[PDB]
Design a binder for this molecule. Structure first.
Ligand SMILES: Nc1ncnc2c1ncn2[C@H]1C[C@H](O)[C@@H](COP(=O)(O)O)O1
Ligand SMILES: Nc1ncnc2c1ncn2[C@H]1C[C@H](O)[C@@H](COP(=O)(O)O)O1
Ligand SMILES: [Cl-]
Ligand SMILES: [Cl-]
Ligand code: NA
Ligand code: NA
Lengths: 520, 520
């Protein structure tokens, strides 16, 4: 038969294939969908009143719908695969994908007298649809939990969909928009029924898997001397102290002086903090210290900020308070976890072209030099883009994000997601799922009221995401061995990126993308 | 319909057909699959610490998967069939096979208040796949229990899959590899869904079902005398005792002296032990006595060793402590069972070309003979292969193993499984099965955690293995009746290879392969 209950409505594909440039990832996981909001759209707001501050106010709605998110690299990549990709390519980018939902099973749970039994409702349905026109608030790219699990074996719960609208305090404005998912043409399923579609990534720039092997400043030959001169002295050396103009040709020895065609990238000052406890000043400056941007009278934290080097050499302990991504160690607590639990990423690789996060961009003269007045200079903590700058985008990690929807705005600049990734105008459409409400027996005499009693049930099934990535091979003529991600030989009680003695896959550290080195 | 619940998704084939050389075996058994490891991959290690010795240390993983093993002769052969094959062929070998899984039924068991009920989950699925590329640690050929039952009627449990990786003590090394079965493209089934495939055995040498009827030493005509001489005496006979060189032509009477073109096979000394209790020395030399090979600082027992004759004639009671296969009598206990329970196989058939297990290979001179110094000789307990050797491989039994995967190594010698069988580089692929986890109702509010609650269920179904064997008929011109496996006429209370009064099929003794005799 075509579609029956005693028939697999799809298969399990979890494979990675490398041919030439194209690497194909395929993942399958087993999901479970709870009933959300008792089949109800609820208005949710957080007020100014009460303990909560004004910066955490919001207005929105929580829907009875769940959504499928695969926006995390680890979903499509095995740790071993991530290794192959990082260690041999100068870049890569998504090309197309394929989604599938199958072997859907709906169960109805009954409880009597502390006795609980779960069996099948076959006639029951499950609704699915894609926001192919992008008419629904984009949830994804907010780094929200609920993406497919990293380990294929694990079975996961489907995230609940909800959105935010313009708000003043705990109130909404005239502008704020209320969306109803049901007002969307969605496809329905019964077990033996399957859903699926395909999408093709708009053209996007290859991510850089290469870390520079020349600093922006050191772009010139040591042996030669520039044909240009610079002002070397305003005053005669020694006792005389009489103003004079002396000019010198910037040479190899005087490298700093010599003129350059390109200058470092932009910077927003980030407060510095040291892993060692003692060094830090004894105040709770987590918030007061941190850089932030104020929008509509509300100050939001600048996380994770513009792309900047985490630390200057040998300052490894240092990190921006808010200027890097942080990943919890497995089993880590959501609130107030200790330092040991967290994995603080490090973006030092990009130090060569990008400004250090914790230091000034540089200095600019504050006044005209005078016969009486002395020259002055001021520091640059906040530096915007100017002609001649070059820079590197923030890195993605095996457990990082992949893409993000570029806001539909009149304009924007270098729209590469600040958390790292590919910026798409038309990203993979949001996939929405929901269990169709099955009413409990209605009262015998007609009632104008809307039914408030339903059979309790949840659904389960497999999901498949297959993505085709385009690689960009290395062309380096570097004579010496390059740096590469490896797993240390030395013995240990547990294996890296494996299950422990209890059956708990764990990702020991974040894994960057740039190991291979390319010239500037 | 094509695939429905009320439809047999396969039939029962249990037949043997003989045409010409080709004998075709077909078996079908009914299996049951329990849930394994609560749907969890678990890290398993045995430590140096505690009672366990260092030689029993290991590191590995236990998977939620089960595997189908047919690697035992009795599965495909009826005892009567084994008889026909052994009693009329000089050899045979596997040619191709066909596997099938069908009539899959998944049951979900419920327990309330000490009340247990088992019914059907139809929408539930079962995953299956073959390691057609050999990317998974090879379990088979380790003589592990869990192969299809010998008796067709019996219903069996499916073995759990698990593997081992490089370990130091209870720790893993950097090299050690962790495999995830789910990362394998596997096919899913619902009842009315069936799986199946075919494989063809790489070319392999016919097993020898023939026992030699000439000793390697006695390969020459009695009547004739060799045209070659040997050194018969170093000293004059009688009183004189003065050195002289005397040479004689090796004749029929002096058979031992005469030169030969071929010499016996290799040997590793095996400690001798007698079935009679009194003869044996009163010490627990089971381990201390036994020969062993030390790998990576760990001593493993040499079981079952190289192929060697169990005993010289009339030494029938004797056997190598570790140098023969042992099969438990039906109902025999796993640990510390008495001698009566066990069936100790006997490889005396091969004594003619192979060295006796318990005796030295022979002797070699230890020094140069001297006018003053006397000649000396030393025994050879360990003897490696040298030009001119010929030997017989170890026999397979009706309840023995069939093939084994030749380790993917740079080199090897005469790669015939030491436990007996056919050595294949690409053996029948491991067949992996697993019940797909069906989650218990999830909590209403999204949780980042991985689901830990599942409906309890197991599966059942029929399995079919069909193998085509190629025979090699006897060509003997032997005038007298040959020895053959028979069942003794004399009355008994139970029939050989039948069920007893309780319904317990039992294999009374091991059944060899070599009865027919061929010349050397
Ligand atoms: N990841 C990503 N997504 C979307 N747009 C991006 C991305 N990275 C850079 N850009 C911007 C930068 C330029 O404005 C343009 C490509 O020009 P070019 O001269 O090639 O830099 O796209
Ligand atoms: N059972 C089995 N499996 C695999 N390889 C085997 C087996 N028996 C012997 N051999 C080896 C011995 C030789 O190296 C080769 C066949 O050569 P020949 O001159 O025919 O002995 O194969
Ligand atoms: Cl976490
Ligand atoms: Cl047994
Ligand atoms: Na709510
Ligand atoms: Na276990």
């Amino acid at each position: 038969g075509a579609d029956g209950v005693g028939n697999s409505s799809g298969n399990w594909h979890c494979d990675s294939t490398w041919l030439g440039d194209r690497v194909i990832t395929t993942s399958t996981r087993t999901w479970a969908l709870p009933t959300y909001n008792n089949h109800l759209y609820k208005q949710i707001s957080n007020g100014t009143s009460g303990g909560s501050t004004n910066d955490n106010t919001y207005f929105g709605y929580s829907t009875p719908w769940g959504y499928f998110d695969f926006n995390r690299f680890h979903c499509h990549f095995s740790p071993r695969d991530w290794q192959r990709l990082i260690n041999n390519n100068w870049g890569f980018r998504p090309k197309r994908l394929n989604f599938k939902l199958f072997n859907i099973q709906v169960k109805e749970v009954t409880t009597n007298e502390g006795t609980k039994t779960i069996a099948n409702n076959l006639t029951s349905t499950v609704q699915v649809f894609t926001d192919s026109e992008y008419q629904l608030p984009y949830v994804l790219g907010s780094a929200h939990q609920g993406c497919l699990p990293p380990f294929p074996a694990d079975v996961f719960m489907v995230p609940q969909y909800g959105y935010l609208t313009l708000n003043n305090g705990s109130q909404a404005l005239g502008r704020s928009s209320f969306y109803c998912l049901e007002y969307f043409p969605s496809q329905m399923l019964r077990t033996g029924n399957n859903f699926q579609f395909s999408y093709t990534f708009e053209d996007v720039p290859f991510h850089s898997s290469y870390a520079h092997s020349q600093s922006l400043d050191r772009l010139m030959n040591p042996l030669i001397d520039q044909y240009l001169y610079y002002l070397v002295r305003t005053q005669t050396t020694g006792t005389g102290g009489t103003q004079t103009l002396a000019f010198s040709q910037a040479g190899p020895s005087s490298m700093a002086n010599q003129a350059r065609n390109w200058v470092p990238g932009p910077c927003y000052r980030q407060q510095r903090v040291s892993t060692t406890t003692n060094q830090n000043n004894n105040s709770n400056f987590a918030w007061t210290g941190a850089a932030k941007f104020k929008l509509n009278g509300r100050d939001s934290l600048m996380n994770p900020g513009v792309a900047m080097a985490s630390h200057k050499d040998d300052d490894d302990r240092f990190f921006p308070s808010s200027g890097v991504l942080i990943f919890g160690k497995q089993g880590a607590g959501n609130d107030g976890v200790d330092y040991s639990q967290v994995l603080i990423t490090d973006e030092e690789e990009i130090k060569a072209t990008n400004p250090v996060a914790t230091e000034e961009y540089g200095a600019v003269a504050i006044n005209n030099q005078a016969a009486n007045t002395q020259a002055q200079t001021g520091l640059v903590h906040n530096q915007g883009v100017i002609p001649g700058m070059v820079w590197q985008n923030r890195d993605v990690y095996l457990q990082g994000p992949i893409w993000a929807k570029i806001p539909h705005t009149d304009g924007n600049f270098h729209p590469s997601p600040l958390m790292g990734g590919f910026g798409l105008k038309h990203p993979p459409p949001q996939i929405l799922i929901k269990n169709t409400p099955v009413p409990a027996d209605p009262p015998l005499t007609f009632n104008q009221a809307k039914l408030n009693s339903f059979i309790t049930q949840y659904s389960t099934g497999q999901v498949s995401v297959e993505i085709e990535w385009e690689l960009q091979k290395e062309n380096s003529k570097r004579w010496n061995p390059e740096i590469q991600y490896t797993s240390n030989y030395y013995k240990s009680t547990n294996v890296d990126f494996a299950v422990n003695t209890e059956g708990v896959y764990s990702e020991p550290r974040p894994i960057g993308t740039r190991y291979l080195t390319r010239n500037l």
